[PDB]
Amino acid sequence: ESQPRQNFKVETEAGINRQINLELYACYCYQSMSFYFDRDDVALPGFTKYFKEKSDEEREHAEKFMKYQNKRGGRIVLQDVKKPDRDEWGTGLDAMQASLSLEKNVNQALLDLHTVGDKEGDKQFMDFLESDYLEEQVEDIKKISDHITNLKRVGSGLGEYMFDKKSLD
Amino acid sequence: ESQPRQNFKVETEAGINRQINLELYACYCYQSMSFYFDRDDVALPGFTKYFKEKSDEEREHAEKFMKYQNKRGGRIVLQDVKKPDRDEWGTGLDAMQASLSLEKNVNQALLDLHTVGDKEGDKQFMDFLESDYLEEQVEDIKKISDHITNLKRVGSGLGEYMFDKKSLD
Amino acid sequence: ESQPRQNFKVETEAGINRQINLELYACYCYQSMSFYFDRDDVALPGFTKYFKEKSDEEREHAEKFMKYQNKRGGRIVLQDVKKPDRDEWGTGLDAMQASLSLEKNVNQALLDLHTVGDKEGDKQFMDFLESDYLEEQVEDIKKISDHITNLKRVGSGLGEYMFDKKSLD
Amino acid sequence: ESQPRQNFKVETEAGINRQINLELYACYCYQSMSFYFDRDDVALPGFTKYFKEKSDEEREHAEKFMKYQNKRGGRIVLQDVKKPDRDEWGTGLDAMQASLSLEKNVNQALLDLHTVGDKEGDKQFMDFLESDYLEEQVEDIKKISDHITNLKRVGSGLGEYMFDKKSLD
Ligand SMILES: [Fe+3]
Ligand SMILES: [Fe+3]
Ligand SMILES: [Fe+3]
Ligand SMILES: [Fe+3]
Ligand SMILES: [Fe+3]
Ligand SMILES: [Fe+3]
Ligand SMILES: [Fe+3]
Ligand SMILES: [Fe+3]
Ligand SMILES: [Fe+3]
């Protein structure tokens, strides 16, 4: 038994390892999205930078979980990170809708991980999840939803071009 | 009779109390408008901030009247502030037209309150109304009218999106 | 179903709407208290400013709940905000005791809303309530209690006058 | 007929001359009050400075009326300024009540002068009175009323001493 281990169950430890892989997968998806919009036949530089930043955020999420795993005395076990399910991401609206779907899947996984911690009485882990993940997911899902609404509002063509300039930094 | 009371009639005092309630109602209406545009299926952040600022202005109007009531030696009597007459405010153009209608109703109420002060010979109250309310109402009604004209000019979709970015801070 | 909605029940949504109305009611009560102490036959400027600040805080509480409602994908439904139950608030001690009673009622309502979120498994909403409301209520109830103790200690007359100068900014 | 004279009646001109004398009388009264509180058997330095400042304000009021008289093409006719009706002004509360009575008498005289301007159609004079005198009188009468309430609240002795330190600069 590792030196720090206290009130830390193997199921909670295994849940963190599977959440680490999912965060790395989201990181990979956003990285793919970012360079899709850097294609010369797509060429939307606001979308490129927006998804690059989200990719870096998801990598921070994964590493924070790795750090937490060590803090509690668990052991990181890494798996393959699967390639994203698409090579190309359509319009700015398509990519934003794919992004909402991804973020809601990540959120459900975090809520399920909270449920593991809850049944095992892992009081500190529950607060760590709420404070550093659940609140941010709620913020991001609201922001992406707003973006989707505005991408429908502006339409294709000049509208998409203007959204890229005005809504994304 | 209160210590400051001089040239201050009960009808004027009662008129101020009813104007206080109307200003609080306008405050509530703009607050509702503001958070309607913060909905994820509306998502117009310029409209949100614009109506939040107007809501704060109407609250200042109400409190200035409460302060004046005390200055003259009257007594504030508060009533329920009714919920706004709509839950949802349509397009940016619809909300701007509802706002013009509200501001003109407030202006007519102020003009009617000026008429009470005039017939009672309340010289100071008349100047207080003209200097701190009537002039501002004329400015606001002109600004909202301009906004309505431009919201018709730009049309729906990208036009509404652009107006949100360019005409509202 | 709105775009952001995830793990967000209609009972929780309805509880937030009723809490919004209660926060606006507390805002209205403190606004009434503030201008009661600005009366020329009361004339306690520390009390006036103290209750004005608390009124602004309660308005922030209401708007934060409106913002949260939108974040989760709920819909704000506003109701009449009832006028406060008193027109006049007695001595500084009476107003402070009315204020403690109000704050404890708000606190119980928040605890009841936490109970709704708990039974529905709304993990993020529970943390939002604890972090942004429950902690502040505990602080305020302790501060008001201290003020009540000191208002009894100093007595009426010069004591109330001195408390206004020394204990309220 | 003087060069600037336009829409300026002899009754309005005579009313300004009598108001000038009244402002100088108020100046003299406050000057007497100020040095009464500088007596070694009174010795309230906040009261002394407060009434000295009010005396200087009333002198400014008189001179502004003299300036206005010249602006419109009238002619200043000065009269004796009568000594104040008391040699000694009692307690701080007595002096504050005498001061409220004086200010209300000045206010009624200004309102009567406004009535002269109104019946003669002197539009500019009416606005000059409202903007530079009537508004300030309403402010001062409210402030003095507040002071009277607090002087009753604190009582005699230490209360009066504390009011002198805390409520008057
Ligand atoms: Fe993540
Ligand atoms: Fe994210
Ligand atoms: Fe207003
Ligand atoms: Fe005027
Ligand atoms: Fe307005
Ligand atoms: Fe609150
Ligand atoms: Fe509070
Ligand atoms: Fe004067
Ligand atoms: Fe004065």
Short mmCIF file of N, CA, C and O in Angstrom, two decimals, chain A residues 142 145-147 149-150 153-154 158-159 162-167, chain B residues 38-45 156-158 160-162 165-166:
data_model
loop_
_atom_site.label_atom_id
_atom_site.label_comp_id
_atom_site.label_asym_id
_atom_site.label_seq_id
_atom_site.Cartn_x
_atom_site.Cartn_y
_atom_site.Cartn_z
N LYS A 142 -22.24 25.83 -22.04
CA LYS A 142 -23.05 27.02 -22.29
C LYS A 142 -22.43 27.89 -23.38
O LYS A 142 -23.15 28.40 -24.26
N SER A 145 -22.88 26.22 -26.81
CA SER A 145 -24.28 26.36 -27.22
C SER A 145 -24.55 27.74 -27.81
O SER A 145 -25.22 27.87 -28.84
N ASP A 146 -24.05 28.79 -27.14
CA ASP A 146 -24.16 30.15 -27.66
C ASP A 146 -23.54 30.26 -29.05
O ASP A 146 -24.13 30.87 -29.95
N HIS A 147 -22.35 29.69 -29.22
CA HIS A 147 -21.68 29.74 -30.51
C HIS A 147 -22.51 29.05 -31.59
O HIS A 147 -22.64 29.57 -32.70
N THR A 149 -25.77 28.67 -31.68
CA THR A 149 -26.89 29.54 -32.00
C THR A 149 -26.48 30.66 -32.94
O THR A 149 -27.20 30.97 -33.89
N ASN A 150 -25.32 31.26 -32.70
CA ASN A 150 -24.89 32.37 -33.54
C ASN A 150 -24.41 31.89 -34.90
O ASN A 150 -24.57 32.61 -35.90
N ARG A 153 -27.44 31.64 -36.79
CA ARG A 153 -27.98 32.97 -37.07
C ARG A 153 -27.29 33.60 -38.27
O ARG A 153 -27.95 34.16 -39.15
N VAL A 154 -25.95 33.49 -38.36
CA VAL A 154 -25.24 34.21 -39.41
C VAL A 154 -25.31 33.49 -40.75
O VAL A 154 -25.13 34.13 -41.79
N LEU A 158 -20.44 34.63 -45.96
CA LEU A 158 -19.99 35.82 -45.24
C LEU A 158 -20.30 35.72 -43.76
O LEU A 158 -19.51 36.17 -42.92
N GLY A 159 -21.44 35.12 -43.41
CA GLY A 159 -21.78 34.96 -42.00
C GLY A 159 -20.73 34.16 -41.24
O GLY A 159 -20.26 34.58 -40.18
N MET A 162 -17.58 36.27 -40.87
CA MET A 162 -17.73 37.30 -39.85
C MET A 162 -17.70 36.72 -38.44
O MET A 162 -17.10 37.30 -37.54
N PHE A 163 -18.38 35.59 -38.22
CA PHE A 163 -18.32 34.95 -36.91
C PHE A 163 -16.88 34.63 -36.53
O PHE A 163 -16.46 34.86 -35.38
N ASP A 164 -16.11 34.11 -37.49
CA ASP A 164 -14.69 33.82 -37.26
C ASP A 164 -13.93 35.06 -36.79
O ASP A 164 -13.04 34.96 -35.94
N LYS A 165 -14.28 36.24 -37.32
CA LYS A 165 -13.54 37.45 -36.95
C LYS A 165 -14.06 38.05 -35.65
O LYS A 165 -13.27 38.55 -34.84
N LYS A 166 -15.37 38.00 -35.42
CA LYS A 166 -16.00 38.77 -34.35
C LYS A 166 -16.27 37.96 -33.09
O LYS A 166 -16.22 38.52 -31.99
N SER A 167 -16.60 36.67 -33.21
CA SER A 167 -16.96 35.89 -32.04
C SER A 167 -15.80 35.08 -31.48
O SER A 167 -15.85 34.69 -30.32
N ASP B 38 -29.43 36.42 -22.93
CA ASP B 38 -28.40 35.53 -22.44
C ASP B 38 -28.81 34.06 -22.57
O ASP B 38 -28.01 33.16 -22.26
N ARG B 39 -30.03 33.78 -23.01
CA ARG B 39 -30.44 32.41 -23.28
C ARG B 39 -29.54 31.81 -24.35
O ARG B 39 -29.07 32.52 -25.25
N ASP B 40 -29.28 30.51 -24.23
CA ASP B 40 -28.40 29.84 -25.20
C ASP B 40 -29.01 29.76 -26.59
O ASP B 40 -28.26 29.61 -27.56
N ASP B 41 -30.34 29.81 -26.71
CA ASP B 41 -31.00 29.83 -28.01
C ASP B 41 -31.26 31.25 -28.50
O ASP B 41 -31.95 31.42 -29.51
N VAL B 42 -30.76 32.27 -27.79
CA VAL B 42 -30.83 33.65 -28.25
C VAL B 42 -29.40 34.16 -28.41
O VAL B 42 -28.95 34.46 -29.53
N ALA B 43 -28.67 34.27 -27.30
CA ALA B 43 -27.22 34.44 -27.30
C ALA B 43 -26.77 35.69 -28.06
O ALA B 43 -25.96 35.63 -29.00
N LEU B 44 -27.27 36.85 -27.63
CA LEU B 44 -26.82 38.13 -28.18
C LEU B 44 -26.20 38.96 -27.06
O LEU B 44 -26.90 39.68 -26.34
N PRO B 45 -24.87 38.89 -26.89
CA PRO B 45 -24.25 39.49 -25.69
C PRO B 45 -24.28 41.02 -25.67
O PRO B 45 -24.25 41.60 -24.58
N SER B 156 -32.70 40.41 -40.53
CA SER B 156 -32.45 39.32 -39.59
C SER B 156 -31.15 38.59 -39.93
O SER B 156 -30.51 38.83 -40.96
N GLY B 157 -30.75 37.69 -39.03
CA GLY B 157 -29.59 36.87 -39.28
C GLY B 157 -28.29 37.61 -39.06
O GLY B 157 -28.05 38.16 -37.98
N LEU B 158 -27.44 37.63 -40.09
CA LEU B 158 -26.14 38.30 -39.98
C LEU B 158 -26.32 39.77 -39.62
O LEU B 158 -25.52 40.32 -38.86
N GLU B 160 -28.64 41.21 -37.67
CA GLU B 160 -28.83 41.30 -36.23
C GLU B 160 -27.54 41.03 -35.48
O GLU B 160 -27.22 41.70 -34.50
N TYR B 161 -26.77 40.04 -35.95
CA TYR B 161 -25.50 39.71 -35.32
C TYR B 161 -24.53 40.88 -35.38
O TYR B 161 -23.88 41.21 -34.39
N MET B 162 -24.43 41.53 -36.55
CA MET B 162 -23.54 42.67 -36.74
C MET B 162 -23.98 43.88 -35.91
O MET B 162 -23.15 44.58 -35.34
N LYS B 165 -22.76 43.61 -32.50
CA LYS B 165 -21.33 43.86 -32.31
C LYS B 165 -20.98 45.34 -32.50
O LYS B 165 -20.14 45.87 -31.77
N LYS B 166 -21.63 46.01 -33.44
CA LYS B 166 -21.21 47.34 -33.88
C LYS B 166 -21.99 48.48 -33.25
O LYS B 166 -21.42 49.55 -33.04
#
